[PDB]
Design a protein around this ligand. Structure first.
Ligand SMILES: Nc1nc2c(ncn2[C@@H]2O[C@H](COP(=O)(O)OP(=O)(O)OP(=O)(O)O)[C@@H](O)[C@H]2O)c(=O)[nH]1
Ligand SMILES: Nc1ncnc2c1ncn2[C@@H]1O[C@H](COP(=O)(O)OP(=O)(O)CP(=O)(O)O)[C@@H](O)[C@H]1O
Ligand SMILES: *[C@]12O[C@@]3(C)CC[C@H](OC(=O)[C@@H]1[C@H]1[C@@H]4[C@H]5[C@H](O)[C@@H](C)[C@H](O)[C@@H]5C=C(C)[C@@H]4C[C@H]13)[C@H]2C
Ligand SMILES: Nc1nc2c(ncn2[C@@H]2O[C@H](COP(=O)(O)OP(=O)(O)O)[C@@H](O)[C@H]2O)c(=O)[nH]1
Ligand SMILES: [Ca+2]
Ligand SMILES: [Mg+2]
Ligand SMILES: [Mg+2]
Ligand SMILES: [Mg+2]
Lengths: 429, 331, 437, 54
């Protein structure tokens, strides 16, 4: 059951490259594509993300997309840059100018057929394609505008396959341009319609984890991307290693998405420990479990206590008491049962994987479908309106052929989404 | 922390229990439909016993014994006593009784009637109630299930007043089937002199709405054990313990041991406790008779605080420890 | 001699089937290569064990079994397991992508594409039977294949084998091992569609097996392997009468006449004793009286429920090992004086008793200790309706908000099928209520 | 407490003990519903492709 991975634009390719570095290490694959591991678990489900070439080389089933060459040149020169299939680098030269319209309608439109050609070649080599994972930001032009253009074209050609995204949401605190709320609002509606699962990663949360928890006085995008790649490794653990729960993209969606539009997840990771003598301290299962549910370990800058969990998937990695994992997971639900909707019984699923991530003896990864995610879309909507009420910065988009009505419609669509979440934050049983 | 749910809002007894539980700071009240509870204060009718004890990681306890209705329904109690060899038709402490359906042992009652009246050995039977000496008026009143039983014509009468009464005893059965008799009983007394030909029913509600002397001898037509014991000593040269309580304890134990195999939760996936209200009558020879068993009893206002705290200590905290007013009837 | 064909559907059905056929071979002295040194009739026979095993000219004893799963990884471990030599490729059917825990995907979308193949492979087995009596069908309630494809197959079997009996071994979902939030939906949907097509169904609640493994085998976190070896013991006790000489439950029809007086109320409760940890060097051997008494403990039942608060319609005691009728009767007499056992008025208060002198076989290396005598009680009690009440309650909670319903409608299922199935379960609970009080 | 119908063989025996006496869809109908569901899938997919065409 192959998954096809797509990474688009600057943010998508920098986080995507780190992800492939992380999981390549977990599966024993060096930058040469040669396996040098010690456990057969590393290869059991290796074909989910890797193709096998002659000589028993393993090639990531990854397509790298950008409208300018800069970031992908860096990837090709990066640590694991030589592991990607050269033909899977698809790029233009003009850039997208942090402009959703350029990504979605003009510059992106000229390149998208080339990307779909590579997607089709990868998909054709799958004897049981699960679907696609896309990594991108929503605040820029290529990842946001061309990324959502790609998602729509892929759905048209592969309508019965799962579409999953890791979507980096912009925040004014970690921002490149003032138009990010426009790009993000336009993209969210695309995701509402055309993905099955979207992991919402807020750069605000990432920055605060680095600064407040990890004690990094000056976080960089690189530091932010460390957290994201480790989180992506965690939430895909059940896809990449033998297991029973959420072992493929569709069973995961069936467990996590009770209503089709409410498929935006808050990911979390534990432990998050400051570097120093504290980093060698052993974690216990109770501490690991309490930290994985702590808001400060979540990455969508939403307070889960402001809403309710529709569904939760938890993944524990490392050698630990599986009996004690069950105990502590039940303790969390039975102690704070008010934060789990009571009309979805047994809505918290727990997986355990014996292989721990690099740099940790034990870790836990959290995937929550919480109505509190409405706070994230409320923030974007407020920032959108503050500018749109004065039509500020719109000429960048009308110059690419867009009309104001499309903005009005994206605004209404996100307000609808927010009110849909509010419908279930109060619904009782 | 421990969690519980409240599902009988009209229960005065467990309203006080839940308020004590919250007042410990170690219990939280969940919504009544939240399944992740340790303790259920269940509804009176159709308590969903089949959904208890299926929550991984939760020890679950409920304040009712499934199957205890057999003992706490008029017709059921008669059937249980007459058909259980542990209690026998030859049961000395339960008045002669029969079950009759309107619109069944109605034939057997008439047979024992004909024998009673033709001997002239007193023939008054009780049945929204009415006492009659002719069976015609008794069987006539029912067809508009019921039970008719021998009316104790020679009750013990308190003096002064020539007053009839009944004794309520509260009994707590915990999850180990320990039987705890609350040390404090209460006599629901009639304020009217007992007329042999409203003064026959000692119900607190009837004695407040239809009674002329409500509350003149004792506050609320309720005489507690200290005063009654003192009376038996002064008037009859005996004690409450000797003349009455030994029989009450005997009867309580017989009834509850009889149904233990049917209702015990010893090896069940959930646990039960329940509070019972046994009603007794005392005749002029100081013989105690069981009248009925209530499965959802209230308490005397002066005793609510003491008994409810006792319920937390014996029934709830014994299963869910935190960080004697009862007499244990042994087996 | 009349043949029985076993069909194993989805992961739970296939892995339980593997456990059972492993145990059968141990019980009948059939080695993993299919040979049976005690079978002196080469290449043929009409013995009791031929009900479940055909024979090749080379003397291989081949299970009369078909395995079906919508993904290949579970059945691929049958193809390479210890007893791989027992089965030929025609018996193992696998698809590409599974039903994603979605009854509609298993029943409509994916089932429609594979049903004809499965029936063709069953037809091949049926053509080898001189007098096929029917089918034993193993499946979970909770999986999309176990729920959705099973109900489709059961419908077609009623059409293609109208006079044949069909028995079920059904895995009822438990959150402690369950894999999907929507399993209550799949359970109600498949029960509704299968009800009129099944003559007798033995439900096994994973919760009960899980707790028996934790308490009696002292396994702290039971796996499917532990669970299935215990389930295979129960299944083996139930089918032993079809596979060995005897006079009780010698054909599938007798299961119905002995255990199911009313067609819709066809879910007998199984209770099994003793379950003894093999890591114990010495365990006091339990008497006939003690293992029989244990048949009335909820802790030993395949479904946790309280038979004291229901009524029995039939009761069968199936003993294996050193058991003589005299001790059974003396045990029953005592138990009748101590326990609450109430039959419905129009049924006789009694027990049909079967004794097989061969004690239970245990898998070498397994968790179960060898015992000198064991018993499985099959009682049709209304108390098992507690399990329906639990499932229907969880259904009601989710369906009131239409949670996850779009997954089913998206596969071509109509929303009305949900409420139709739920009303059927409401009528079932009402039926048990009518019989039980 | 009476024993009835005692059968004895080399492999075991069976008997009954009494403590107290007593006091469809056709093939075309199935394929009709399967094809109806499949047409609902085809309709929903046609609507989606139409939406994407817009
Ligand atoms: N006792 C037991 N239960 C199992 C086993 N395998 C799965 N289950 C249970 O079966 C239910 C899940 O159904 P599965 O059989 O795995 O699903 P499936 O039939 O393969 O259907 P899909 O995978 O959705 O196509 C859950 O309740 C599991 O706990 C097993 O080997 N033994
Ligand atoms: N056989 C009898 N002989 C004399 N008095 C009797 C009697 N049976 C009932 N009574 C009187 O009837 C009154 C109440 O009737 P009964 O106890 O049967 O139902 P009840 O519901 O009123 C009791 P409770 O108020 O505790 O629920 C009692 O106080 C008792 O004095
Ligand atoms: C990653 O994140 C941190 C929070 C701890 C958990 C996991 O283990 C790691 O090793 C790693 C750490 C990263 C630091 C490296 O240890 C070191 C080379 C340098 O200081 C890295 C900078 C960071 C911001 C990370 C902090 C650690 C990983 C998910
Ligand atoms: N976490 C993270 N965010 C990034 C990174 N690069 C850019 N961003 C964010 O992505 C948005 C800018 O979009 P970007 O990917 O650079 O534009 P694109 O190339 O047109 O897709 C802003 O919200 C930035 O804060 C990165 O490497 N990591
Ligand atoms: Ca032979
Ligand atoms: Mg940029
Ligand atoms: Mg009463
Ligand atoms: Mg499966």
């Amino acid at each position: 059951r192959e998954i096809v991975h797509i990474q688009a634009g600057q943010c998508g390719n920098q986080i995507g490259a780190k992800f492939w570095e992380v999981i390549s290490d977990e599966h024993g694959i060096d930058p040469t594509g040669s396996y040098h591991g010690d456990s057969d678990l590393q290869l059991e489900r290796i074909n989910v993300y890797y193709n096998e070439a002659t000589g028993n080389k393993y090639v990531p089933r990854a397509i790298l997309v950008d409208l300018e060459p800069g970031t992908m040149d860096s990837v090709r020169s990066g640590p694991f840059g030589q592991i990607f299939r050269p033909d899977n680098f698809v790029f233009g030269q003009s850039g997208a100018g942090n402009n959703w319209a350029k990504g979605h309608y003009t510059e992106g439109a000229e390149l998208v057929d080339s990307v779909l050609d590579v997607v089709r070649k990868e998909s054709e080599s799958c004897d049981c394609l699960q679907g696609f994972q896309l990594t991108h930001s929503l605040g820029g032009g290529t990842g946001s505008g061309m990324g959502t253009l790609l998602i729509s074209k892929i759905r048209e050609e592969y309508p019965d396959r799962i579409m999953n995204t890791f979507s980096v949401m912009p925040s004014p605190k970690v921002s490149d341009t003032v138009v990010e709320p426009y790009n993000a609002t336009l993209s969210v509606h695309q995701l509402v319609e055309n993905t099955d699962e979207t992991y919402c990663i807020d750069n605000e949360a990432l920055y605060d984890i680095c600064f407040r928890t990890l004690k990094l006085t000056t976080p960089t995008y690189g530091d932010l991307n460390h957290l994201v790649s480790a989180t992506m490794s965690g939430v895909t653990t059940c896809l990449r290693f033998p297991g029973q729960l959420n072992a493929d993209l569709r069973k995961l969606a069936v467990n996590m998405v009770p209503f089709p539009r409410l498929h935006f997840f808050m990911p979390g990771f534990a432990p998050l420990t400051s570097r120093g003598s504290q980093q060698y301290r052993a974690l216990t299962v109770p501490e690991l479990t309490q930290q994985m549910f702590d808001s400060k370990n979540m990455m969508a800058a939403c307070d889960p206590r402001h809403g309710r969990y529709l569904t939760v998937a938890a993944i524990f990695r490392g050698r630990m008491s599986m009996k004690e994992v069950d105990e502590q997971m039940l303790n969390v639900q039975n102690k704070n049962s008010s934060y789990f909707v009571e009309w979805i019984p047994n809505n918290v699923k727990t997986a355990v994987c014996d292989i721990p991530p690099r740099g940790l003896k034990m870790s836990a990864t959290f995937i929550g479908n919480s109505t509190a995610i409405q706070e994230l879309f409320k923030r974007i909507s407020e920032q959108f309106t503050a500018m749109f009420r004065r039509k500020a910065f719109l000429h960048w988009y009308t110059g690419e052929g867009m009309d104001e009505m499309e903005f009005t419609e994206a605004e209404s669509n996100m307000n609808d989404l927010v009110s849909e979440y509010q419908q279930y934050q109060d619904a009782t049983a | 922390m421990y969690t519980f749910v409240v599902r009988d809002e009209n229960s005065s007894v467990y309203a006080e229990v839940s308020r004590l539980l919250l007042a410990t700071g170690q219990w939280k009240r969940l919504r009544k439909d939240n399944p992740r509870f340790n303790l259920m204060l269940g509804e009176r009718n159709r308590l969903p016993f089949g959904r208890l004890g299926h929550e991984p990681g939760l020890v679950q306890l409920v304040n009712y014994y499934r199957g205890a209705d057999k003992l706490c329904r008029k017709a059921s109690l008669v059937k249980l006593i007459k058909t259980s060899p542990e209690l026998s038709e030859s049961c000395t402490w339960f008045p002669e009784s029969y079950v009759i359906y309107p619109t069944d042992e109605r034939e057997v009652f008439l047979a024992a009637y004909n024998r009673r009246r033709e001997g002239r050995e007193g023939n008054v039977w009780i049945a929204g109630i009415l006492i009659s000496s002719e069976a015609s008026e008794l069987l006539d009143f029912i067809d508009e299930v019921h039970v008719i039983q021998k009316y104790l014509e020679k009750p013990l009468l308190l003096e002064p007043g020539h007053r009839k009464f009944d004794i309520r005893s509260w009994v707590l059965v915990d999850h180990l089937y320990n039987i705890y008799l609350y040390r404090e009983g209460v006599l629901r007394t009639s304020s009217e002199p007992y007329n042999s030909a409203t003064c026959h029913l000692t119900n607190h509600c009837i004695q407040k709405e239809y009674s002329k002397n409500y509350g003149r001898y004792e506050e609320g037509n309720e005489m507690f054990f200290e005063e009654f014991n003192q009376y038996l000593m002064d008037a009859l040269n005996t004690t409450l313990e000797n003349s009455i309580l030994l029989q009450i304890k005997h009867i309580i134990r017989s009834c509850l041991m009889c149904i233990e195999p049917a209702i015990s939760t010893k090896h069940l996936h959930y646990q039960s406790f329940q509070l019972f209200g046994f009603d007794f009558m005392v005749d002029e020879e100081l013989k105690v008779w069981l009248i009925e068993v209530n499965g959802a009893p209230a308490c005397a206002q002066k005793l609510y605080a003491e008994l409810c705290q006792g319920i937390v200590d014996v029934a709830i905290s014994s299963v869910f420890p935190l960080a004697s007013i009862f007499i244990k009837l042994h087996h | 001699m009349r043949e029985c064909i076993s069909i194993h559907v989805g992961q739970a059905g296939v892995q339980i089937g593997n456990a059972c056929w492993e145990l059968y071979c141990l019980e009948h002295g059939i080695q993993p290569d299919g040979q049976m040194p005690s079978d002196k009739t080469i290449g043929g026979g009409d013995d009791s064990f031929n009900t479940f095993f055909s024979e090749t000219g080379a003397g291989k004893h081949v299970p009369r079994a078909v395995f079906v799963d919508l993904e290949p990884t579970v059945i691929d471990e049958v193809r390479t397991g210890t007893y791989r030599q027992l089965f030929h490729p025609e018996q193992l059917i696998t698809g590409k992508e599974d039903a994603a825990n979605n009854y509609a995907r298993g029943h409509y979308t994916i089932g429609k594409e594979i049903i004809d193949l499965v029936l063709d492979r069953i037809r091949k087995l049926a053509d080898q039977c001189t007098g096929l009596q029917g089918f034993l069908v193993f499946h979970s309630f909770g999986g999309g294949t176990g729920s959705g494809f099973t109900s489709l197959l059961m419908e077609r079997l009623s059409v293609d084998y109208g006079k044949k009996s069909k028995l079920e071994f059904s895995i009822y979902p438990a959150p402690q091992v369950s894999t999907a939030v929507v399993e209550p939906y799949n359970s109600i949907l498949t029960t509704h569609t299968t009800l009129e097509h099944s003559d007798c169904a033995f439900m096994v609640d994973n919760e009960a097996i899980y707790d028996i493994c934790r308490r009696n085998l002292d396994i702290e976190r039971p796996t499917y392997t532990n669970l299935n070896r215990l389930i295979s013991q129960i299944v083996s006790s139930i089918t032993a009468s079809l596979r060995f000489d005897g006079a009780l439950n010698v054909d599938l029809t007798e299961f119905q006449t002995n255990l199911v007086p009313y067609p819709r109320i066809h879910f007998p409760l199984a209770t099994y004793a003793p379950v003894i940890s093999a890591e114990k060097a010495y365990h006091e051997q339990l008497s006939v009286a003690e293992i029989t008494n244990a048949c009335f403990e909820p802790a030993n039942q395949m479904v946790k429920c309280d038979p004291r608060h229901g009524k029995y319609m039939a009761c069968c005691l199936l003993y294996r090992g050193d058991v003589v009728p005299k001790d059974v009767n003396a045990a029953i007499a005592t138990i009748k004086t101590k326990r609450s056992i109430q039959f419905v008025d129009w049924c006789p208060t009694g027990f049909k008793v079967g004794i097989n002198y061969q004690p239970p076989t245990v898998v070498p290396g397994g968790d179960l200790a060898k015992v000198q005598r064991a018993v499985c009680m099959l009682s049709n009690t209304t108390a098992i309706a507690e399990a329906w009440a639990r499932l229907d309650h969880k259904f009601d909670l989710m369906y009131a908000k239409r949670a996850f319903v779009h997954w089913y409608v998206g596969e071509g299922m109509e929303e009305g099928e949900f409420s139709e199935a739920r009303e059927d379960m409401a009528a079932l609970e009402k039926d048990y209520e009518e019989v039980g009080v | 407490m009476e024993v009835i119908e005692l059968n004895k063989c080399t492999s075991g025996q069976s008997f009954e003990v009494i403590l107290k006496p007593p006091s469809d869809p056709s093939l075309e109908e199935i394929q009709k519903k399967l094809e109806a569901a499949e047409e609902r899938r085809k309709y929903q997919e046609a609507e989606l492709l139409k939406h994407l065409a817009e």
